[PDB]
Amino acid sequence: TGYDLSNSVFSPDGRNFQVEYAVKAVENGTTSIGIKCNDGVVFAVEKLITSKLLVPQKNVKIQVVDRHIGCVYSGLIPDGRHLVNRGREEAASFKKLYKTPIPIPAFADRLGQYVQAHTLYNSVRPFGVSTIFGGVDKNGAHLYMLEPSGSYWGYKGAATGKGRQSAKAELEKLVDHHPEGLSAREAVKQAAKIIYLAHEDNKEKDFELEISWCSLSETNGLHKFVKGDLLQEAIDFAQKEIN
Amino acid sequence: MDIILGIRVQDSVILASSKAVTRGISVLKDSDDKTRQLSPHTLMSFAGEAGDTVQFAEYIQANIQLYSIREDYELSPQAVSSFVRQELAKSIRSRRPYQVNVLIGGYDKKKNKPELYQIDYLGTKVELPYGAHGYSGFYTFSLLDHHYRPDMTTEEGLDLLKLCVQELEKRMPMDFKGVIVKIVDKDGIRQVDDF
Amino acid sequence: GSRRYDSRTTIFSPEGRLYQVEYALESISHAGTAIGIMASDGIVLAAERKVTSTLLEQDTSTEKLYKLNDKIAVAVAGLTADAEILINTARIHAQNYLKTYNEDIPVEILVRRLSDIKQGYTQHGGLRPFGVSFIYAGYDDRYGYQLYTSNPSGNYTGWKAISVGANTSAAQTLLQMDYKDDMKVDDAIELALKTLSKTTDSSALTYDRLEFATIRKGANDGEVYQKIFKPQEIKDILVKTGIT
Amino acid sequence: NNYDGDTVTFSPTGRLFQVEYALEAIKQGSVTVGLRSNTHAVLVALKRNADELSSYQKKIIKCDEHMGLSLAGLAPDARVLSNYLRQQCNYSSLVFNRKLAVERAGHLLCDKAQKNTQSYGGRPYGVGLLIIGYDKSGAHLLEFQPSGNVTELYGTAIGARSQGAKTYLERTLDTFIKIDGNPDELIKAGVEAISQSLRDESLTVDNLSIAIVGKDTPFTIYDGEAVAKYI
Amino acid sequence: TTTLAFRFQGGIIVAVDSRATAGNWVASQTVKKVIEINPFLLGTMAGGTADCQFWETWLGSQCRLHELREKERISVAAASKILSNLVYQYKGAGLSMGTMICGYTRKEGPTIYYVDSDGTRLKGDIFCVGSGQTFAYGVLDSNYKWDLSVEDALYLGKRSILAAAHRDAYSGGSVNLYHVTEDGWIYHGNHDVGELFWKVKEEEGSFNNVIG
Amino acid sequence: MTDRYSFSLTTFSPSGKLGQIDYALTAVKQGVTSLGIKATNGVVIATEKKSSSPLAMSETLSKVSLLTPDIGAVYSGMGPDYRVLVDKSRKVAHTSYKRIYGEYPPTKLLVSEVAKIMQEATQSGGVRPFGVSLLIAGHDEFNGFSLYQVDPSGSYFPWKATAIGKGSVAAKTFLEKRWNDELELEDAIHIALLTLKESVEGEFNGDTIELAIIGDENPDLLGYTGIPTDKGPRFRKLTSQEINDRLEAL
Amino acid sequence: DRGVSTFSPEGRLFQVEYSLEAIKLGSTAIGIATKEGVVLGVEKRATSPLLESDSIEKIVEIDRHIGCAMSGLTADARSMIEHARTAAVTHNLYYDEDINVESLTQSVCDLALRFGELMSRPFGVALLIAGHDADDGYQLFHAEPSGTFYRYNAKAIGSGSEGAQAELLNEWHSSLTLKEAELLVLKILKQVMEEKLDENNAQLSCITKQDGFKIYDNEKTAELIKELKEKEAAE
Amino acid sequence: GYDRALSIFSPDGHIFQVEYALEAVKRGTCAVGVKGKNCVVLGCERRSTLKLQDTRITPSKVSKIDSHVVLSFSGLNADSRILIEKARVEAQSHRLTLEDPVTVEYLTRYVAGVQQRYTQSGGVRPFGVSTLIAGFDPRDDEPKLYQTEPSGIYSSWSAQTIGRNSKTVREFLEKNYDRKEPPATVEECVKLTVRSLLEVVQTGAKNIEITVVKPDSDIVALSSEEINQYVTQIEQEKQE
Ligand SMILES: *[C@@](C)(CO)[C@](*)(O)[C@H](Cc1ccccc1)NC(=O)[C@H](Cc1ccc(OC)cc1)NC(=O)[C@H](C)NC(=O)CN1CCOCC1
């Protein structure tokens, strides 16, 4: 054996064990989710409060790309930041040449190819993050989830991290109960509930909720963080459902 | 710089080179030796652009000396002249070419023959019985066409050379402050101190 | 990273030997024997082709003996493909020297440079050395007739008579036995063929398993001629010395 | 074990051992403490000597007039990273006439450290940093780890026995956060914090290192007789 | 500028003026045109002020590095050749320098090298460099003997700069004197032409062209 | 990133073997049989078209390739390696010869250039040797007709006739009995078909056999007229119909 | 094998830690700092009696105000000294002043970690850098291949270092004269050296504000050796 | 480019590649340097398993770097050519810029620096060569003899030997060389050098090379007969 010691090496199965090992790092991370809605997307993440000394609201994890795309990830946080930095470069060069802001499927393949490139050589390490991202473009709303292998698909709802299975089960209920569609303001409230429900798989430390959203009607197609009254309203909705 | 002459006779090559170094309206020096010994039996005189002349001469000198140490052997005058020509032939298509004209006087010990090569800054090589660079040639070539014989002695060559310097001192516009004369033969290179 | 797969071709053993050079020499010891013999009036190059097939085109073939310029030739022992890389370099180097100095390159200078290239592959670059040993046979007006040998280490030495490739130990003993300094070319031709005939791993030495060449001053007055022997000429010289 | 030969290799449980070994170098380092109020931010560092004949390794480095850090681990790696911060703070001033936000300073260090954890040949940085600063949004304290993880805090501590100070600050949180417009009291709280990490040794005059930045205070370091006030 | 340096029985005299010009504008009257490289080496400056000042100070740093590396003071020949090879690399770029590298070493004795920005390097006994070089030559040549005393050689050098300072519009200010011996260089003062001219005129009886 | 493999992947073993070259030759041994026979007025190169599937169109896969109008190539071993070698061989014939001398290279020199390319894959950083042996048949004015074999090491040998690949040992023996120095091209084609039938197992026809010749100039294949000196390619690929015609009088 | 810039599980760089072992094999070098000057002394340690000991150059001038002593793979020090000298002279060119001893040391220490897969391995030599400047006066630094430097009142490096350092711990005080320091280096060198100490196998040097960095003659050191032996016998 | 760090530290603090390069030197033929009152003599062993050699053209063991300095070596022959070439180029470069030939110390320092560079550069192995560099500084009559080795350290020697069985000949020189009175003449210096090689060599036939360097670029190589006379004379005094 030794097939798992080097990246880009095929095992006799036809697998790249190094990528599968990166997936383990992702499974270790905190829970993050994405919910596609009527005219946009909603992102939410679990922030473990390690200590009282952490300044609340001041370790932001959701990142914006361009002015219309939002990204959130689970696993190695620095690896996620590297991927967003690339995403921003890719989006800038697309806007530079083609004028229009990068479409979400276009943006999804830019990250996809870049992450896939890090499975081609033994001189680089695969990304230790699964990234949930999306936004609003000329063709409406799109939600994506990208994995260490470079594999990505479009999603109605997405989840990754330590509470992914709890979150996925909750997401599947929304898709079944709302075939016509979920509203942006509803999705924000649901996102809060699902993070609170997915927190059961990480319940030693208590946590801080962070939400963002892009919506054609609510945020005018731009990425914005959910703060203040709308955030506390979403937190209360979630608190009511766990009890 | 300015005046460099060369005469090949029966058994030796004689190089005469002006002693003046002028810059502007001032003769800065009247005892300048415009020559480098490339090897024990090979001498090179040079004239041309300020700085370029000595820089080139010493660069060639270093290379020939390097060859001599590497092979424990002296390159023939023909071989040295070909090396020098090629360096100039490269130079002329550089960003800043060497503006240097040279005469190479040597005694081939294998052939037991004196040899004189005239090479201009373009890399134009010719073997000659007598040679000159710059305006000097316009007087000396015709003079030597008349008085030169191929079987002359070194003493006859020096008298023939005195005739050239006298003509130049009479008809040339500039004061070149006389010449340093050197003889290349089977016993190597030596300088005539009273000319 | 890629460190895992690096053989480290340019390192020392604990004994102070270069692994790859030693193994390249081991490779060369299985190649067909080549012999050089320097006489007072010329040089002989003789080499044994590696086990021939009857359908091999013998006349339009070159495997052992190559021309570097009009005054210098080489006998090869090892990988032919490796030798041709080095031969083309040597050919170019000779022309560079001629272009620079308007004189044919002295034999040792050419030999030193080719040997310096081999040396480089043993000290830096992480590549395998050339699996080739040369016998250089040439003439210049400084030292006259000269024989050299170089090997994968890049070390070269001069010889009166020398063998490379297979059975060098036995071949060298035989050459050391019958060689003398006042020898002529035609005597050297006979010694070369006799030595191969005794050291050969084949049943009997024939014309189709040999390459032969002489470098004589046997042209007309003070000039050197290279003669790469044709098949029929090797057949005749083999009969003339009574080997077949 | 078989997956710690370089940073480019993941272990079967998804760990980077070279990054974890770099993290270990910080744990061996001498303790340093960071804490802030709303007006000031304070670093306190325990310096370490080779023996009684040697000097005490300096732990605190100034990055700009409004920013600086303290180090724990490989000091040369702190020099490289601090120098990078000095340049980034400086770029922001020359090009934008803008003091670099302490948060951006953290983002820049995170991204620089990360690149060393994904490529062959390189190694992770072997040092932990505590960055303090005062910018357009008030006082700040950051904790840098060479994994790339940067974290904004009210107070913290890194190095050997840092858990003592970190527990103390966690208790004292409600007190020291409201020490506004009083430098000497915020330092006293930090000096008392670092005292919870001491064993057999006590704070002397050439042992203690204190730094402060705030609303009307440039980033300045105190050593020698200037820290005698706080012992 | 007018700068000179000549060799004689008692070593080397070096004399320079102190004027700097920008066209016809007199920019300075108190410029230092001699740079002291070490206790045994001097450099004179003529041509572009920045070119001279920058590269001769740089030359001093190279000479220091030589004696650190070789545990021996650099020769005048080697020091001059560092400068000449440097400016030759910039040949055509437009550097403007006329310099003289003066000094004493054991192996060479007193030595003077002329180095300029088109790459000319010349060993010699007497040189005058600058816009007023010809005026200095006129006086220096017509009074020079090898057997001059240290006192007379100092005066001749001083008097030659004065001659040029007077006639050359782009020379003047004051005269700086130096004497180089086997023991090193010795500074022999700054001499303002404002007072020196009248003092020389009165005492020597020369400069009869001028209204007394 | 970047190619960090700047070191040799083929190195000498203690016994003196170059492992990767030996293993490449082993790959060639596994390959399908191809052969070449030199006649007095031409050369023939032939091989079996091993079809990967009956749904595959074996006409789209050419094992015998034109390099120059007078030179053709066939192989045994790994097809993909051969394909890129043909691309490189065609280009080098232009860049390092035709663009200099205004004419096509003689067989021996083109062969030499291909050998160089294969030798470099034996020594250069981060590459394995090519897993093929080539048989190159050609004609040029001053050397006449020739036939060469190029091995993974980069070694090449001129042949009167030979075979490489699967059943080369038996095929070479067959050719030794039949070859003489008076063979006419048609006699060589006949022997080629005979020799190939021994190694081929399944169908033996013009659709399962690929065969080309280097013979007379073909003015009809030139594509133009008007230049007397230009007389057309000596390389010609025998059609599926042309092969079957000769298989009846076999 | 393994990466050159690899961390051990204890959080140390393997190569840096191994180069420290090479330095322990090196000959002893001792430095002592006083208010009258800094003294640098080394063990020459000739491998054979035929070797001309005065050609052994383990004390070296960097500038007039900075001197340097070495221990370990001394061939590795040549490029470090070359850098130090260039750094010192370059700073004088850019700023028309002497460069601070600490700044010099920092510049040399910047080279240290510039290795990996830059040079192929760390330096196998430790340096004692002694000098004077107007700001911080007489200083002694110990520069390691880790890129770390400590200021010392006194320091020993090499094979006899840990024994010599324990001796320096007792003997050093803030009122030592230069002469007292000279004798102290000779005394401690004689203790840890294998062969018997004399003027041919040990070398002294000092840096003072007034006279700068000076390597002592064999005649001068011989008298200090004789003065030392007499003083130890005198009680 | 090939980047691998081949020369690296081991746990005990040794650079094995440098130390294995010293083993190559130990395998090489013996070389000895002895400096007298007014000369330096370089002696070299030549192994006699090679008969049928052509000594006219075979590379000599002692090489001229300039007209006043010579270099002999022990170890890999191919490696030594690279060092000799670089040294010869630096010799001419020094004459060009300093207008003075190299000192023997400077030339040695350069060659030693090159050797050191190959011990901490990526992609290269150390030179398997130790050198003896001898000569006279320009306008100086004091003899100079230096030794270099793969690590890059160099030093001056009154007399020294390198190569195989060098420890035997060093033993001889250590008791036979008086520092207070070096070989006063050329004859004495050559004899002591030949004597020292005869402790190790075999036959004093075509096995010993001797090169004598005197002040002001006076370098000459002794012939077989000249050396054979020393061999003949030494053996007759020995039978006592
Ligand atoms: C006399 C006075 C004639 O100029 C001297 O040569 C004097 C020499 C000197 C040397 C060192 C310190 C002071 C004085 N030269 C000058 O004073 C010099 C004259 C000069 C001007 C321009 C030149 O470029 C062709 C060359 C020589 N004056 C200056 O350098 C003045 C102070 N500066 C400028 O002219 C600025 N220029 C320099 C060239 O680049 C453009 C800006």
Q: Is E184 in the pocket of ligand 1 (CB under 6 A)?
A: no
Q: Which domains occur in chain A, in start order?
A: 1-243 (3.60.20.10)
Q: Which of E17, E21, E96 to mutate to test the pocket of ligand 1 (most atoms within 8 A of CB)?
A: E21
Q: Which atom of ligand 1 is nearest to the CA of E21?
A: 17
Copy the structure tokens of residue H26.
């130990």
Q: Which of D53, D54, D126 sits opposite G7 (nearest CB)?
A: D126
Query: CA nearest A120 in F: which residue?
Result: F1
**Any ligand 1 atom below 6 A from CB of E52:** yes
Residue C3: left (phi > 0), alpha (psi -120 to 50), or beta? alpha
E75 touches H at CB < 8 Å: yes
Does residue E119 have its Cβ closer than 6 Å to ligand 1?
A: no
Residue D16, domain extent: 1-231
- Say if CB F132 and CB F75 are below 8 A apart: yes
* Tokens matching residue B25: 């309206």
Does D118 sit within 8 Å of A82, measured CB to CB? yes
> For residue B38, what are the domain limits?
1-195
Q: Which residue on chain F is closest to C1 by alpha carbon?
A: F4
Q: Which helix (H) or strand (E) holds H95?
A: helix H77-98
CB contact under 8 A, H23 and C159: no
CB contact under 8 A, D8 and A7: yes
Please give, rounded to a whole number of angstroms, the shortest distance from the CA of B184 to a CA of chain H.
22
Ligand 1 centroid from CA E46, angstroms: 8
What CATH number has the domain bearing residue D14?
A: 3.60.20.10
Contact check, Cβ <8 Å, A123/C4 = no
Contact E56, E117 (CB under 8 A): no
In angstroms, the CA D206 to CA D191 distance is 14
Residue C20: which of C10, C29, C34, C35 has the closest Cα? C10
What is the CATH number that goes with domain C1-244? Answer: 3.60.20.10
The crossing angle, in degrees rounded to 10, of helices C80-101 and C107-123 is 130
Contact across the interface for D76 and G150, Cβ inside 8 Å: no
Chains contacting H (3+ CB pairs below 8 angstroms): B, C, E, F, G
What does residue B119 show for φ and ψ, rounded to 5 degrees?
-130, 120
DSSP of E80-106: HHHHHHHHHHTTTS---BEEEEEEEET
Exactly one of A30, A131, A160, A219 is catalytic; which is it?
A: A30
Of G116, G153, G172, the CB nearest to D121: G116
Distance of CA H112 to the CA centre of its chain: 13
Our CA-based measurement puts residue C196 at a distance from the nearest CA of chain H, in whole angstroms, of 18
In chain F, what's the furthest Cα-to-Cα distance? 63
Give yes or no for residue E82 CB within 6 A of ligand 1. Answer: no
SS (H, E, C) chain D: CCCCCCCCCCCCCCCCHHHHHHHHHHHHCCCEEEEECCCEEEEEEECEECCCCECEECCEEEEECCEEEEEEECHHHHHHHHHHHHHHHHHHHHHHCCCCCHHHHHHHHHHHHHHCCCECCCCCCCEEEEEEEEECCEEEEEEECCCCCEEEECEEEECCCHHHHHHHHHHHHHHHCCCCCCHHHHHHHHHHHHHHHCCCCCCCCCCEEEEEEECCEEEEEECHHHHHHHC
CB C153 within 8 A of CB H78: yes
Tokens 């000159």, residue? B132
- Provide, as residue numbers in chain H, all residues whose Cβ is less than 8 Å from the Cβ of F5: none
**How much distance in Å is there from the Cα of E167 to the middle of ligand 1?**
19
- Assign residue D44 a region: left if phi > 0, alpha if psi is -120 to 50, beta otherwise? beta
**Cα-only R_g, chain B:** 16
* A50 flagged as catalytic: no
Residue G152 amino acid letter: Y
Cα separation, A159 vs B49, whole angstroms: 79
Which residues of E have a catalytic role annotated?
A: 1
Measured between beta carbons, which residues in chain C are less than 8 angstroms from residue B110? 141
What contacts E22, CB < 8 A, 6 or more positions away? Answer: none
Give the pairing of strands C144-150 and C132-140: antiparallel
CB atoms closer than 10 angstroms to residue G76 = 25
Query: How many angstroms separate the CA of residue H2 from the nearest CA in chain F?
Result: 5
Distances in whole angstroms, Cα of residue D141 to Cα of each of A58, D67, D100, D150: 11, 10, 14, 10
Q: CA geometry: angle at A170 spanning A165 and A174, to 5°?
A: 140
Rg of chain D over Cα atoms, rounded to whole angstroms, equals 18
Architecture of domain F1-250: 4-Layer Sandwich (3.60)
Determine the Cα–Cα distance for residues B145 and B137; give it in Å rounded to an integer.
11
- CATH number at B167 reads 3.60.20.10
Asked if G6 reaches chain E (Cβ–Cβ under 8 Å), the answer is no
What is the E1 CA–ligand 1 centroid distance (Å)?
9
Measured in Å, residue E97 CA sits from the centre of ligand 1 at: 9
CA atoms within 13 A on the CB side of F208: 18
Cα gap B151→C147, rounded to integer Å: 43
Which CATH superfamily, name and number, covers H1-240? Aminohydrolase, N-terminal nucleophile (Ntn) domain (3.60.20.10)
B58 touches chain H (CB under 8 A): yes
Contact of F33 with C33, CB cutoff 8 Å: no
SS3 state of residue H54: coil
DSSP letter for each residue of chain A: --TTSSTTPPPTTS--HHHHHHHHHHHHS--EEEEEETTEEEEEEEEE---TTBPTT-S---EEETTTEEEEEEE-HHHHHHHHHHHHHHHHHHHHHHSSPPPHHHHHHHHHHHHHHTTS-TTBPPP-EEEEEEEEETTEEEEEEE-TTS-EEE-SEEEESTTHHHHHHHHHHHHHH-SS---HHHHHHHHHHHHHHHGGGG-SS-EEEEEEEEETTTTTTSEEE--HHHHHHHHHHHHHHH-
Q: What are residue F235's DSSP bridge partners?
A: F214
G121 touches chain H (CB under 8 A): yes
Burial of C50 (0-12, 13-18, 19+ CB in 10 A): middle
The answer to whether H6 faces chain F, any CB pair under 8 Å, is no
Strands of B55-177 (E only): list them: 100-108, 113-119, 125-127, 130-133
- The experimental method, as deposited, was X-ray
CATH code of the domain made up of G1-235: 3.60.20.10
Distance (Å, whole) CA E117 – CA E85? 10
On chain F, the residues whose CB falls within 8 A of the CB of H1 are 6
Closest residue in chain H to residue E66, using alpha carbons only:
H98
- For residue A7, list chain D residues with Cβ-Cβ distance below 8 A: 8-9
Token pair of A223 as six digits: 């990425």
Domain boundaries, chain F: 1-250
DSSP E62: H
**Which is the closest atom of ligand 1 to the Cα of E53?**
11
Place of tokens 């960097």: G62
From chain E, pick out residues whose CB is under 8 angstroms from the CB of H139.
107
Q: Where do the structural domains in chain G lie, given as residue ranges?
A: 1-235
Q: What would the two tokens of residue H107 be? A: 């030339």
Interface test with G, best of E32, E56, E68, E74 (most G CBs within 10 A): E68
Pick among C3, C4, C6 to test the A interface (most A CBs inside 10 A)? C4
Residues from chain A contacting residue D154 (CB–CB below 8 Å) = 52-55
∠ CA C143-C148-C154 to the nearest 5 degrees?
125
In three-state secondary structure terms, F20 is helix
How many beta-carbon contacts under 8 Å exist across A and D?
Answer: 100
